[PDB]
Amino acid sequence: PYTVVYFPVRGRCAALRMLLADQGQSWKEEVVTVETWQEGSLKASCLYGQLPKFQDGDLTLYQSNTILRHLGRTLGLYGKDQQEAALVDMVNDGVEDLRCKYISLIYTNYEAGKDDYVKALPGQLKPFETLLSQNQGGKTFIVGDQISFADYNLLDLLLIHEVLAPGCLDAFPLLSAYVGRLSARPKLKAFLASPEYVNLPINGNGKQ
Amino acid sequence: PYTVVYFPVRGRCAALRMLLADQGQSWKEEVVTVETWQEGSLKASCLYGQLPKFQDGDLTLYQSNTILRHLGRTLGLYGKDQQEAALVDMVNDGVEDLRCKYISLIYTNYEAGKDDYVKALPGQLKPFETLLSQNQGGKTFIVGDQISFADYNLLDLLLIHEVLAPGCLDAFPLLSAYVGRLSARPKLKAFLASPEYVNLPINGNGKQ
Numbered sequence: 001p002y003t004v005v006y007f008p009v010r011g012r013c014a015a016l017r018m019l020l021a022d023q024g025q026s027w028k029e030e031v032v033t034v035e036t037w038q039e040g041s042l043k044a045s046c047l048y049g050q051l052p053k054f055q056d057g058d059l060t061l062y063q064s065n066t067i068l069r070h071l072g073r074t075l076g077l078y079g080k081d082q083q084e085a086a087l088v089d090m091v092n093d094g095v096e097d098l099r100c101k102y103i104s105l106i107y108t109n110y111e112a113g114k115d116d117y118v119k120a121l122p123g124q125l126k127p128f129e130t131l132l133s134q135n136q137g138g139k140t141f142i143v144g145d146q147i148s149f150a151d152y153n154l155l156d157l158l159l160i161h162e163v164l165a166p167g168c169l170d171a172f173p174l175l176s177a178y179v180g181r182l183s184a185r186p187k188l189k190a191f192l193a194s195p196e197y198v199n200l201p202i203n204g205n206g207k208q
Numbered sequence: 209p210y211t212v213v214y215f216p217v218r219g220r221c222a223a224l225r226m227l228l229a230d231q232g233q234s235w236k237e238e239v240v241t242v243e244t245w246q247e248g249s250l251k252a253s254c255l256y257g258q259l260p261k262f263q264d265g266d267l268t269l270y271q272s273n274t275i276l277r278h279l280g281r282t283l284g285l286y287g288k289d290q291q292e293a294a295l296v297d298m299v300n301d302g303v304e305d306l307r308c309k310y311i312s313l314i315y316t317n318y319e320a321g322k323d324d325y326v327k328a329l330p331g332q333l334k335p336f337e338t339l340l341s342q343n344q345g346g347k348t349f350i351v352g353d354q355i356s357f358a359d360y361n362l363l364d365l366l367l368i369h370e371v372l373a374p375g376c377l378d379a380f381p382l383l384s385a386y387v388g389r390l391s392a393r394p395k396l397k398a399f400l401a402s403p404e405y406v407n408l409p410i411n412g413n414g415k416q
């Protein structure tokens with residue numbers, strides 16, 4: 001079945017977990033402690049020496065977005081055609097770009113960079129609001145009329161940003177409603193409310 | 209048909225151009241000058257306010273990897289099945305991670321960071337050598353027995369690294385032979401030797 005190998009944090013596994021949960025998929029969580037990691041053997045066996053590591057049967061994958069695209073491809077959450085598949089990629093790549101900046105802030109320059117980051121946030125979120133406005137008035141999903149892996153990734157990005165800068169979505173009606181709507185999906189809502197999600201820190205250094 | 213909108217540099221368009229050329233595809237190059245960019249209108253119309261911008265008929269795309277995946281999907285350069293597709297993604301995501309570090313070095317910390325970067329290079333290239341060693345002894349492509357968009361992206365990454373740190377592939381026989389082999393492909397060889405490629409700087413700040 002599925003197995004996600006990661007440290008005890010939401011981080012780069014939050015989106016794929018929401019996906020699996022919302023899709024009614026079962027998966028196993030292999031929690032790696034900082035101690036076990038610093039031992040070296042696991043890291044050495046990882047393709048790029050990093051986590052998350054994912055297992056789908058005997059298929060072992062690395063890279064959070066590779067896992068997202070894999071699940072999207074195999075579960076039918078990758079658009080209805082090539083045109084949509086490309087747009088889903090465009091959204092996910094944009095989410096990744098911002099996630100990298102967020103990660104850099106959190107682990108590299110939180111105290112001194114937070115103000116500049118938050119000030120730059122609106123311009124960084126604007127693209128996703130525009131995307132929604134161009135797709136059925138933002139009433140459905142980020143691309144097309146069916147959910148995609150990019151939705152879960154974008155949703156997580158928006159959620160962690162609401163924590164970083166409370167109210168950042170207030171000026172973005174479509175993104176705001178989008179968050180509430182997706183978060184309301186039965187399986188997803190239950191997952192987001194569960195200890196499994198709630199008692200895990202967003203990041204590994206206690207910052208958010 | 210196809211249109212590539214970018215600044216007059218190889219940068220994030222080199223891989224997709226090699227792909228198009230090697231695949232015998234025709235495309236138009238719309239060169240954006242620093243003056244045009246600083247004018248503001250183009251930037252404002254770009255989804256994430258950045259280039260490259262790509263047009264396939266009336267489909268307008270942004271994000272270099274979205275363009276790569278789109279061409280790979282539509283041209284059949286994305287693996288033979290879903291498993292290979294996942295592996296192709298895993299390779300491309302790894303290429304992107306290193307490309308981001310390369311870009312960071314080039315544009316924000318060349319002088320002071322070059323030594324540390326080059327020293328860390330071997331460990332960053334090892335994953336691709338390993339991937340090659342696990343696929344038909346590295347005699348064909350990065351994933352499977354057919355070329356994929358990830359091959360062009362990886363090839364570009366390797367090429368720019370040989371310029372940054374001459375001889376960096378000496379420690380990796382498979383990657384070294386891989387570069388020579390792919391570069392020898394008729395259409396690609398002609399493209400790499402053409403003014404279109406050769407007279408374009410790798411980066412925009414004159415560093416490499």
Ligand SMILES: CC/C(=C/SC[C@H](NC(=O)CC[C@H](N)C(=O)O)C(=O)NCC(=O)O)C(=O)c1ccc(OCC(=O)O)c(Cl)c1Cl
Nearest residue numbers: 007009011012049050051052063064065103107108204305
């Ligand atoms: C638990 C906190 C930690 C999660 S794992 C982080 C990292 N893995 C990746 O960054 C995966 C990137 C892939 N491209 C992907 O998309 O999957 C990892 O495995 N690190 C272990 C290693 O030895 O490399 C986390 O986010 C984290 C923790 C600590 C630090 O450093 C602190 C600092 O001062 O910079 C960072 Cl930068 C990060 Cl991202």
Ligand SMILES: CC/C(=C/SC[C@H](NC(=O)CC[C@H](N)C(=O)O)C(=O)NCC(=O)O)C(=O)c1ccc(OCC(=O)O)c(Cl)c1Cl
Nearest residue numbers: 097215217219220257258259260271272273311315316412
């Ligand atoms: C011509 C040099 C320039 C090419 S365009 C760079 C950038 N676009 C992207 O980074 C695309 C990223 C997407 N995720 C993708 O994958 O496609 C861009 O459009 N910049 C214009 C803008 O206004 O944002 C280039 O590489 C470049 C040039 C200058 C600088 O800054 C110098 C510094 O001191 O940092 C950088 Cl960082 C870069 Cl990357």
